[PDB]
């Protein structure tokens, strides 16, 4: 049927992409590859770029998984996003154990530089720092903050910019979905301050793992995130418990309303492959058919001349 690719449709409304997280296991099973080819314009490695996946012991990198994703994307004319270079998730214990500031700075920089160098020029968007905030808006006391202090964020971004000046560099977080929530306010105010200091934060990515009914609030939260003045904002890791068309269309329209929002990435293709499968939160079902939210996004994005 005509005009059924949400990526094609969102591009026709001036955005860069509709994307999805994936990896080798997905691409070779189900109908994921076919759906991504037809309907999506950007992919991200779901897990294969994590620190656990890529640098399981100090200085010794594992790129088979990430390479597969990058190659598939290139073969299929998809943009690539990748991450997360620096966050508290999927960290090896060898990183967590480090207590010396200069050692951890250099471990972090080596991790950033190695990954970004390998894929230099190939990656549209790097999620450089993730989940750096507490719910109250203070900085999360992860190993980087505890050992390096708050300079770890400027250092990560400056390192990333040097490693691949072509990439758009993002900070990302979750629970940025309500405009009155302290975390949302805080990332904005802090990104403003980092950018005023010349830290090369090109984007804020909102990890939109939503519960039912939360789409509406994104219509206020996304504009708020964009007010930090980054060149770009993005929607990441999108899923919605119950997958209501209302929620999904609200999220999409928040993207459309926000000039600097370049695109939307969903957390996966089909419900059974979600980490939250019982909540059926994705756009395709367990038979790989498009759900009502997919079709509602199509209608919302369709445009006579
Ligand atoms: O938007 N994404 O679905 C997504 C998935 C995994 C990631 N790791 N870093 N950034 C990511 C974005």
Name the beta content range: 15-25%
CATH topology: TIM Barrel
Biggest sheet descriptor: 8 strands, parallel, barrel
E-strand count = 8
Tally of domains: 1
Order of helices and strands: HEHHEHHEHHEHHEHEHEHEH
The named CATH superfamily? Glycosidases
Helical content band = 40-55%
Q: What count of helical segments does DSSP give?
A: 13
The separation of the N and C termini measures: 19 Å
How are the strands of the largest sheet arranged?
1-2-3-4-5-6-7-8
The 3D shape can be described as globular
CATH architecture: Alpha-Beta Barrel
Which value, in Å, is the CA radius of gyration? 18 Å
Helix-strand layout with pairing:
Blueprint: H1 6-12, E1 17-22, H2 24-27, H3 32-39, E2 42-45, H4 51-54, H5 64-75, E3 79-86, H6 93-96, H7 101-118, E4 125-130, H8 143-148, H9 152-163, E5 168-174, H10 182-196, E6 203-210, H11 215-226, E7 232-240, H12 245-257, E8 261-266, H13 292-301
Parallel strand pairs: 1-2, 1-8, 2-3, 3-4, 4-5, 5-6, 6-7, 7-8
The site of 6-nitrobenzotriazole (6NT) has 10 residues, from β3 and β7.
Provide a descriptive summary of the structure in words.
The structure is a monomer. The chain is of the alpha/beta class. Helix content is 41%, strand content 18%. An 8-stranded parallel barrel has the order 1-2-3-4-5-6-7-8, surrounded by 7 helices. α1 runs parallel beside α13 and α11 packs parallel to α12. Bound molecules: 6-nitrobenzotriazole. The site of 6-nitrobenzotriazole has 10 residues, from β3 and β7. It is classed as de novo protein. Keywords: Kemp Eliminase, Enzyme, Protein Design, DE novo protein. It forms a monomeric assembly.
